[PDB]
């Protein structure tokens, strides 16, 4: 029915949920941990960029941007008079870069 064996419906809900919330206590364990991960990932970004900045600073060679070929790959003629297809680094200009303009390239990479 509905109101005949109403305590037989109750008992089943109660037994189920007692078990499933122990499995969701491992998800609250997760919730306290991912708070700690987000700070870790920010500290590794500052380090990730630090890496690449070593590469950014000198020694360098100077090229000239001709034209893009995608927006993540571009074409440069280096001032050794050699042409390279090169990675476009992120977090750079893309609106004075695409018209022809000076540009800095690494010399060993």
């Amino acid at each position: 029915n509905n109101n005949s064996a109403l305590s037989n419906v109750n008992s089943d809900i109660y037994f189920k949920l007692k078990k499933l919330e122990k499995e969701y206590e491992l998800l609250t364990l997760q919730e306290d941990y991912i708070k700690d991960e987000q700070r870790h990932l920010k500290r590794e970004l500052k380090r990730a960029q630090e890496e690449v900045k070593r590469i950014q600073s000198v020694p360098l060679v100077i090229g000239q941007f001709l034209e893009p070929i995608d927006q993540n790959t571009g074409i440069v003629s280096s001032t050794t008079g050699m042409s390279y297809v090169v990675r476009i680094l992120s977090t750079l200009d893309r609106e004075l870069l695409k018209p022809s303009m000076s540009v800095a390239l690494h010399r060993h990479s």
Binding site: S4, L17, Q30, I34, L45, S90
Partner: protein
């Protein structure tokens, strides 16, 4: 038999409704509580997934930056020995093996290519060419006209 508007047949099935609130507070309390923790653990996962995307693109991108050379070439001609004669433009000519993306029947003469210098390994076609007839026309420099530039 008995109602779900109230109960029928007093203190037996109105007894069962009488003992409901003791079983009911527990499971209604846990219901809203533990579902909002499911949403919260997912909210704070989502936050760090967003951070993960940004921090990890940098490290794989290092490989691309630390590459040995590129060198734009142009196919003079194929050979059916499964090599291609390629004139590198700043440098000279090398006959060298191809990759899987392209083959000798996707390659024809006067087509510009891109190289990943693993030993001058042909990679893709280049998406650019400057026609040699267009050189003459460029340096001349002409735009288009119609008959309103003659008319009368």
């Amino acid at each position: 038999m008995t109602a779900a508007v109230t109960s029928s047949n007093i203190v037996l099935e109105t007894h069962e409704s009488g003992i409901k609130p003791y079983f009911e507070q527990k499971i209604q309390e846990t219901e809203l509580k533990i579902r909002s923790k499911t949403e919260n653990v997912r909210r704070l996962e989502a936050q760090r997934n967003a951070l993960n995307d940004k921090v990890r693109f940098i490290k794989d991108e290092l490989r691309l930056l630390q590459e040995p050379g590129s060198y734009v070439g142009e196919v003079i001609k194929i050979v059916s020995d499964k090599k291609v004669l390629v004139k590198v433009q700043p440098e000279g000519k090398y006959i060298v093996d191809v990759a899987k993306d392209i083959n000798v029947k996707d390659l024809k003469a006067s087509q510009r290519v891109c190289l990943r210098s693993d030993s001058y390994m042909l990679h893709k076609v280049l998406e650019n060419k400057a026609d040699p007839l267009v050189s003459l026309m460029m340096v001349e420099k002409v735009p288009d006209s119609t008959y309103d530039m003659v008319g009368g």
